[PDB]
A paper describes a structure:
To address this question, we determined high-resolution crystal structures of a bacterial homologue to the mammalian PepT1 protein from [name], PepTSt in complex with physiologically relevant di- and tripeptides in addition to a peptide-free apo form. A centrally located peptide-binding site is highly conserved between prokaryote and eukaryote members, with both operating via similar transport mechanisms. Conserved pairs of salt bridge interactions coordinate structural rearrangements that lead to the vectorial co-transport of peptides and protons across the membrane 3,11.
Careful analyses of the electron density maps, including the calculation of simulated annealing OMIT maps and averaged kick maps 18, clearly showed the tri-Ala peptide sitting in a vertical orientation. The data, however, do not allow us to establish how the peptide is orientated in the binding site, with its C-terminus facing towards the cytoplasmic or periplasmic space. This ambiguity arises due to ill-defined electron density that likely reflects low occupancy of the peptide in the binding site. c PepTSt tri-Ala complex was deposited with the carboxy terminus of the tripeptide oriented towards the extracellular side of the membrane. The tripeptide sits in an elongated cavity formed by H1 (Tyr30), H5 (Asn156), H7 (Glu299, 300) and H8 (Gln325, Asn328) and above the alanine side chain observed in the Ala-Phe complex. Compared to the Ala-Phe complex, tri-Ala makes far fewer interactions with the protein. Another noticeable difference is the presence of a third smaller cavity (pocket 3) that opens up opposite the third side chain in the tri-Ala peptide as a result of the less compact structure adopted by PepTSt in the tri-Ala complex compared to the Ala-Phe complex. The nitrogen of the C-terminal peptide bond in tri-Ala peptide interacts with the side chain of Tyr30. By comparison, the same Asn156Ala variant had no effect on tri-Ala competition, consistent with the complex structure where Asn156 does not interact with the tri-Ala peptide.
Numbering used by the authors: 6 to 271, 276 to 413, 420 to 478
The structure:
């Protein structure tokens, strides 16, 4: 008796992540429109450009805390309570938005989910591995099934939460995301006791008595500095929301920049570290375009599409839908393609070009029909079809390339945060008048950088 040939404990983690992703993407399917609504009622005193910028840097920070939660579980609290309390914090963030408050609660909600997701996201995946003994061949299949639950929860969420918003408003819709995470907690708590190893109720590499003080020193310096920077900013008058967004952008980009300067400074090993830079650049750019689906394309869906008969947030389901459609294809493909399968950097290259083609595609309707009318939903369908096609190329191979150390490995995960941070800047350039320029410009540029990468793709391979 199994769960698709896997240990029964996988079903518990399948359900857990499905409902967490449900809560996350259900919220992000409507959060932008929600901010638009608050602005329209004079409740939220920002521009739409700023609102969209918030979406991007919010994503960026969620990914950033994700690279930290694994450490916290392994060394301090344990993987299983990390997931649980991470879940509680996520639920609370959604609770906060369900309350009769308005713009005043946006910050508290965002902070809660950033921290909570950071605790839950990397450690659920960790617990999936713990189901299999070392050298169990089912491991790949198991993680593949787990990912399917992630995509599934991301697919039904905008459909259900978006419908709820249309029916009963934002506060009810947000409460459904909260309920979703709660379901995840229910199945996780009572399901984990039955099948998860008690070993992971505690940290696996707990701090040694001599390790505690320098860690405390380390984290307290970082906080002190961060606080100091925020102090100076307010003194010199750089205390607007765009200013803080710029600060987090800087932090998000400085972290990998420092790591690269750190590695390159500290002979044969070296060339590869330099060799990874164009790949890391290609990763950031792909994620940038891909992350804009919930921001720029969300705006385009709400303003430029004949979507009078269905909740416009439903467009956010296309991303995980195409992932699920493409997945069993590429599974077969990389297997059947035995003879001369492309290298990992080529995938990176072609992947970025596809993401670039997705934006180029979106430039056509405005150039052909103008940007004052509305166009068919199919333009967006085609765009997501393309960029997900690019994801199938670069995503399954991403951590594979970069692992050919500990900070270096984290940097694949950070490419997601940096592309999103870059988005916090670029996304403010998009509007009705600049639409055709925006898409063409960043579309062509991405393709060319993919063109460059394929030229470079052999030297890097050999290394
Ligand atoms: C792997 C999939 C490849 C997909 C790439 C591109 C395919 C889809 C392109 C979208 C064509 C636009 C649809 C035009 C249409 O239906 O007519 C409506 C007209 O009013 C235009 O707004
Ligand atoms: C919120 C809905 C779930 C019901 C749980 C009620 C218990 C309330 C407080 C105590 C919870 C601490 C649990 C920590 C933990 O590691 O749980 C995970 C493990 O037991 C199962 O996977
Ligand atoms: C451990 C408990 C988890 C419970 C999750 C939270 C959900 C429970 C109740 C949801 C509240 C519904 C929203 C109330 C509301 O004001 O709706 C909108 C109203 O203003 C008019 O449309
Ligand atoms: C199995 C492959 C099927 C699709 C081929 C891949 C993409 C190549 C070309 C797609 C079309 C490019 C955009 C042009 C376009 O949609 O024009 C539409 C009309 O202008 C709308 O009335
Ligand atoms: C592999 C996909 C191939 C798809 C078909 C080729 C697409 C090439 C260019 C499409 C964009 C052309 C739009 C028309 C346009 O902008 O006209 C401009 C006029 O001068 C404006 O007054
Ligand atoms: C399906 C595969 C790839 C399809 C994408 C091919 C599209 C080719 C070029 C993108 C759009 C062309 C730019 C149009 C343009 O800049 O003209 C200016 C407008 O008239 C006004 O802004």
């Amino acid at each position: 008796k199994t769960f698709f040939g896997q240990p029964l404990g996988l079903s518990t983690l399948f359900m857990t992540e499905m409902w967490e992703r449900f809560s996350y993407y259900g919220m992000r399917a409507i959060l932008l429109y929600y901010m638009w609504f608050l602005i329209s009622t004079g409740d939220l005193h920002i521009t739409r450009a700023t609102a969209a910028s918030i979406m991007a840097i919010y994503a960026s920070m969620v990914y950033l805390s994700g690279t930290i939660g694994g450490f916290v579980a392994d060394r301090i609290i344990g993987a299983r309570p990390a997931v649980f309390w991470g879940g509680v914090l996520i639920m609370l963030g959604h609770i906060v938005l369900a309350l009769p408050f308005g713009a005043s609660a946006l910050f508290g909600s965002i902070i809660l989910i950033i921290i909570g997701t950071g605790f839950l996201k990397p450690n659920v995946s960790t617990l999936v591995g713990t189901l299999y003994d070392e050298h169990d061949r089912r491991r790949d299949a198991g993680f593949s099934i787990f990912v399917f639950g992630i995509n599934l929860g991301a697919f039904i969420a905008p459909l259900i939460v978006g419908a709820a918003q249309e029916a009963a408003g934002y506060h009810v819709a947000f409460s459904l995301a909260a309920i979703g995470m709660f379901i995840g907690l229910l199945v996780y708590y009572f399901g984990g006791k039955k099948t998860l190893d008690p070993h992971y109720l505690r940290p696996t590499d707990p701090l040694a008595p001599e390790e505690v003080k320098p860690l405390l020193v380390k984290v307290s310096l970082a906080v002190a500095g961060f606080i100091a920077i925020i102090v100076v900013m307010n003194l010199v008058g750089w205390n607007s929301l765009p200013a803080y967004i710029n600060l987090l952008t800087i932090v998000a980009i400085a972290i990998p920049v420092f790591y690269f300067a750190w590695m390159i400074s500290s002979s044969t090993e070296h060339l590869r570290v330099v060799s990874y830079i164009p790949l890391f650049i290609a990763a950031v750019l792909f994620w940038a375009i891909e992350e804009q689906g919930s921001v720029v394309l969300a705006t385009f869906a709400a303003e430029r599409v004949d979507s009078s008969w269905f909740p416009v947030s439903w467009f956010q389901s296309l991303n995980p839908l195409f992932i699920m459609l493409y997945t069993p294809f590429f599974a077969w493909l990389w297997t059947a393609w035995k003879k001369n399968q492309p290298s990992s950097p080529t995938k990176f290259a072609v992947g970025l070009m596809f993401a670039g083609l997705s934006f180029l595609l979106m430039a056509i309707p405005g150039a052909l029909y103008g940007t004052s009318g509305k166009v068919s939903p199919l333009w967006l369908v085609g765009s997501w079809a393309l960029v997900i096609l690019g994801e199938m190329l670069i995503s399954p191979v991403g951590l594979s390339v970069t692992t050919k150390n500990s900070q270096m490995m984290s940097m694949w995960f950070l490419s997601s945060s940096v592309g999103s941070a870059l988005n916090a800047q670029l996304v403010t350039l998009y509007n009705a008048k600049s639409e055709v320029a925006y898409f063409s410009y960043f579309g062509l540029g991405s393709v060319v950088l993919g063109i460059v990468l394929v030229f470079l793709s052999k030297r890097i391979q050999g290394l």
